[PDB]
Design a protein around this ligand. Sequence first.
Ligand SMILES: Nc1nc2c(ncn2[C@@H]2O[C@@H]3COP(=O)(O)O[C@H]4[C@@H](O)[C@H](n5cnc6c(=O)[nH]c(N)nc65)O[C@@H]4COP(=O)(O)O[C@H]3[C@H]2O)c(=O)[nH]1
Ligand SMILES: Nc1nc2c(ncn2[C@@H]2O[C@@H]3COP(=O)(O)O[C@H]4[C@@H](O)[C@H](n5cnc6c(=O)[nH]c(N)nc65)O[C@@H]4COP(=O)(O)O[C@H]3[C@H]2O)c(=O)[nH]1
Length: 131
Amino acid sequence: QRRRYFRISAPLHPPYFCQTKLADNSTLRFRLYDLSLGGMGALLETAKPAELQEGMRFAQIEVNMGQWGVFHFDAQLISISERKVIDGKNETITTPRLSFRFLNVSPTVERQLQRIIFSLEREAREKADKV
Ligand SMILES: Nc1nc2c(ncn2[C@@H]2O[C@@H]3COP(=O)(O)O[C@H]4[C@@H](O)[C@H](n5cnc6c(=O)[nH]c(N)nc65)O[C@@H]4COP(=O)(O)O[C@H]3[C@H]2O)c(=O)[nH]1
Ligand SMILES: Nc1nc2c(ncn2[C@@H]2O[C@@H]3COP(=O)(O)O[C@H]4[C@@H](O)[C@H](n5cnc6c(=O)[nH]c(N)nc65)O[C@@H]4COP(=O)(O)O[C@H]3[C@H]2O)c(=O)[nH]1
C-alpha cells in the first residue's frame, strides 16, 4: 500500500476546471482528474508551457467544483507525466498529466477536501446509477 489516502476519480465528461497564475502573470488552466486528502491530479489543455515544471509551488489554486462550490488550495507540483488516449481517428493523443501535493493543509482545509470527496463519490455513484 504505497499510497496513504484513497484517491477519488473526477468525471472528465462534465469536467471540473482549475486555474492558477504563473510567475510570468499568465493563467494556467487544467481539468481536475482525481482528488484525495493529500493532493490532486489534473490534465493540461495545451502542451506544457516551458515555465511549468516539477518543484513549483502554487498559492491558492482555484478549484471550481460547480454547484459544490469554489475552493482555493496551496499545492506543490510534484510530477509532470503523460496521459495517452486512443483518438476517434484511432490515433494516440498525448497530453500532460499533473500531480500535486497539497500544502498548508490546516484542519479546516481537509474539512473542505472531505466535503468535495464525498460529493464526488455520490456523483460517480450516480454516473454508475444509470446503466
Ligand atoms: N511522483 C508522483 N507521481 C504520481 C503520483 N500519482 C500519480 N503520479 C503520476 O501520474 C501517473 C498516472 O497516475 P494514475 O492515473 O493514478 O495511474 C497509475 C495507477 O493507476 C497505478 N498505480 C501506480 N502506483 C500506484 C500506487 O502506488 N497505488 C495504486 N493504488 N495505484 C498505483 O498505475 C498507474 C500508472 O502509474 P505511473 O506509471 O507511476 O504513472 C503515474 C505517475 O507518473 C504521485 O503520488 N507521485
Ligand atoms: N490525488 C493525487 N494526489 C497526488 C498526486 N501526486 C501527488 N499526490 C499527493 O502527494 C503526496 C506525496 O507525493 P510523492 O512525494 O510523489 O510520494 C508518493 C509517490 O512517491 C508514491 N506514489 C503513489 N502513487 C504513485 C503513482 O501513481 N505513481 C508513482 N510513480 N508514484 C506513486 O507514493 C508516495 C506517497 O503517495 P501518497 O500517500 O498518495 O501521497 C501523495 C499524494 O497524496 C496525484 O496525481 N493525484
